[model samples]
Target chain A: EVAQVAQSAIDDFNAAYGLCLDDDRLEQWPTLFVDDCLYQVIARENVDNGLPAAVMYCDSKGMLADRVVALRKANHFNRHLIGRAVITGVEGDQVSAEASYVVFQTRNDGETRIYNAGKYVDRFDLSGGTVRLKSRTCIYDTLRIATLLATPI
Target chain B: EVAQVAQSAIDDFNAAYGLCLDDDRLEQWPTLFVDDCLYQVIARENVDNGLPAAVMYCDSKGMLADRVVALRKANHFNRHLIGRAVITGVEGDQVSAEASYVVFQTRNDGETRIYNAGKYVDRFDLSGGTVRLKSRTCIYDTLRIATLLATPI
Candidate 1:
């Protein structure tokens, strides 16, 4: 029953997360995470082979904010399609979750393509009466990204 | 409260559907739907243009079973990564839902590629006391499919 509750919290969190990014609410993106957080977008191959290479890496919420700022100043549009979060474990205020994800990139030419396919390996901090990401390690299945990684997965 | 219940049911249905396909339980695929259910996999462009062209069209559960038999006798490997089902509406026994999905195709060479990206526009039959698909319309976003769509996405 606790898992069900945790699952509900995560579903709501992911829904909000997807909406925020899909709506281009970049400024509010960092608020979804704790002040001290780790966000990394790495390839699944590298992860399986025990490599530390990441295409996008942000250690703290401040870094996430900076990335948002950079995106605002540059890059194009993206629609993040978030999947259902599968709760792996629940330890007090910490919940480990994994969910599949795909990003559709729409360029200036109006051609939308599958930019990235991955799974969000997340640790949720539910201590502050809210579901916020303590760390989100996006393990992308696409070894070769379509163009570039501008959006958060 | 009814919406919540509907959401839960759809979530469970999606989970089972994803598992069945991902685990290659093709033989049990058709039993997830009614006997007279309609299943069609078409291009988004075709759907938008109101065209009837479909890559795979099965008007009945028997047809679906036949397709499964064909797949068993041929084709390669695929992983169906199903996303969270967003319940659109619930009217009596019919529940309209849409969910994003992506298929990963891995050949004998062990190279996995994104085969398809689409949304399943489903009308679920809840009258039978289970979440069986009354009709499933897979409108794929990929204008050009990665390769031949031998596997059901």
Candidate 2:
């Protein structure tokens, strides 16, 4: 039953994460993570090559909230279609979950394109009554990006 | 009680489906569906526009088996990373599930590319004592083909 609870926590977070990105709810995205957290989007090639450079990086909830504010001012928009998360481990108050994600970029002119394809390697803290991310590393498979990745993956 | 059981069925089916595709278990893919089933991959735009055209279509398990046989003869390989399935409905013996997917194509030269990004709109039958897909419509968001889609997403 412990495994079930862990799985359910991941599922709940995944659903909520996708829903928040699919609409104009960027403000709520920051709340999904803890105060001092890690959020980075790095290429798989770089990670495999032992490089630490990331496309987007946020070390705290404050940085995330600031990103949301910047996002609200921009005219660009997209939707994140999150995949099913596979629970990797559960120990004490920490849980590890990984899932693939596809972000679609839509323009004002109704042109939609595949913006990003990646997997979220996430670590969650379950001590705050709800599951919150302690770290989320978005490792992308699509190396050739078509446009400016202004939005979070 | 019924909802929980139905959800468990979907989860089990998804994991098995992904496992079959990840390895050289192509022969087992068709068994995940009923004898009389529908499998099609169509563009999301075409689906929203009421177009009946599909990129890949299969009417029965036999057709799927044929596809697998054809696939086995090819050197192309890819992995279908299935997302979390959201149970859309549960009425009688019919259950509906929807989830996003990202397929990564790898060549013999060690080059990997994002092959496809799509969503699976599936209908399952519970009367079979196990969850089996009655229909799976893969609505892809990526319109531009990166290469030949020789494998299932």
Candidate 3:
């Protein structure tokens, strides 16, 4: 039952989430998370070692919303397309899950290539038996992020 | 019994390890791992998302040794002074644990910044009371490594 819950939540979220990013409607990104959610983009090297450094950290939906506003108000560059997600289950929290994803970007250089490959560690909070993301700890395997992150992962 | 073994091995390794990095005896770094060990300096974002990119990837201790050799032979930039490591624990391998650390670096420019804050996901092989690293997945929370990573973290 719980596995099914995790699966459905991930699938539904991935579908819409991928669109938001691929289409660059990132202002809709924060809506996927709960009001009090954590959104962080961390280095895999740091996570395995227990380091607290992060490329990005958004502690609440408000912060995410602000970021979305800022992206439109000031950020620039790139059109991207995200791929299918591969998810897995975690033991605790009957409500937690993780999924790996990939994204490719078409840029000024004229080649569409890998933009990022990463996993999203998430907590699902159910309301009326429906799931919504409570937190997102997105860890990427890429070593560098040149320039700015104009889109959400 | 093995958990006890694992913890002791972990503690001992970390002690010597902290000192090694602090003193810049980087050439001696490869000695701690088994011959075919995998040492990856991966970004947290990449690992979480199943990406394959890394700042550094050494499949053999030989490559690690080679890297050390190359750095000293051709690279010249920072007059680095590294500080203490505050590290954490990993998972389910009978003999593996994780540690988190923060390292500050002093450059030739005379500014010592908190260069990296990350974790070491270590797998050890304890045979005949001797422990050696089997795999060290070095992940970090810092994605924007603005400077050259000359020394191993």
Candidate 4:
């Protein structure tokens, strides 16, 4: 069934996406999507209001690639501690999942602080063996984030 | 003795702040700070680069009040799911703590999604037996926030 294949693909996508962020491999991060992909970063409040204002809105693959490029070359921040996520709701070729993440930031003096906690809403394309992200949005609940968002959620 | 007081006050500050956010009582949130408080929501990258950029930066108590006012009466979009926080690293009158958060969003058809994830960095002061927030900076690792920050982080 399409659901079965889509489920597996979604799982793999979640794992790979989580690992890429945990490993801090910013360069090769954007290759996991299609050419005309749509990526957005917004708060839960904005999403509820039906407003389309995202902290970072990327409408093309090139923009996504540019984010990775800037994160690697231009931005400077602390490394992130690995995070864990879970996947659910698979029907047909579409699957929706929630990813829970925690990022720990270590200062120069080796002082580490838990940076963030949030989840990911992702859509998958299972035509090919590799899963492509159609839409990925991160909802953050922490009142304070350690600093800036230089990387993907 | 002073360090112990500061550390205890910091712990209290962190707990109170988390509760205020969870309860959506943003109007009273600014009372925890001094009159000439400094609040800024900067990216970790910008902070590291000594760049003065923030999604929201408030230099005075009035500015902080404006943020709350906007969240309450102004137009925006969001849904909040608050979580518990943990404290660590206490030295003298200064202590650092980390909080985990997740925000869930539901649209017209009850389609819910995880919107954001991040932690809080807080500093507080101890006057008499009371604790007050000296500064709070929310740093988000996930560069993409769901939408708008209507409420306190």
DockQ of each: 0.16, 0.12, 0.02, 0.02
TM-score per candidate, in order? 0.62, 0.62, 0.46, 0.45
The fnat scores of all predictions, in order, read: 0.07, 0.10, 0.00, 0.00
lDDT of 1 by residue, B30-143 (tens): 999999999988998787575668988889998999888877776644546687688888789799999988787655554456778899999998885687998999999776
User: Chain A alone, model 3, TM-score?
Assistant: 0.82
Give the Å error, residue A151, model 3: 1.9
Please provide, for model 3 over B94-141, each residue's C-alpha lDDT reduced to its tens digit, 9 standing for 90 to 100. Answer: 366677665444444433345667888877776656768898887888
Looking at model 1 chain B, which ten-residue stretch has the lowest summed lDDT? Answer: B143-152
B11-76: candidate 2 lDDT, tens digit per residue: 778878887888868888999899999999887668657566788899999999988887667644
Q: Distance from true position, residue B2, model 4, in Å?
A: 60
Model 3 chain B scores worst on lDDT over the 10 consecutive residues at B76-85
lDDT of 2 by residue, A3-69 (tens): 7777777886786577467545778899999999999988887886756778888999989988888
* TM-score of the A-chain for all models: 0.89, 0.89, 0.82, 0.76
Model 1 spans with C-alpha error above 4 angstroms = A1-4, A72-75, A146-149, B1-10, B16-153
Indicate the residue-level lDDT of B34 in model 1: 90
State the TM-score for model 4.
Answer: 0.45
What's the fnat for candidate 3, on a 0 to 1 scale? 0.00
Q: Residue B111 in candidate 3 has what lDDT?
A: 34
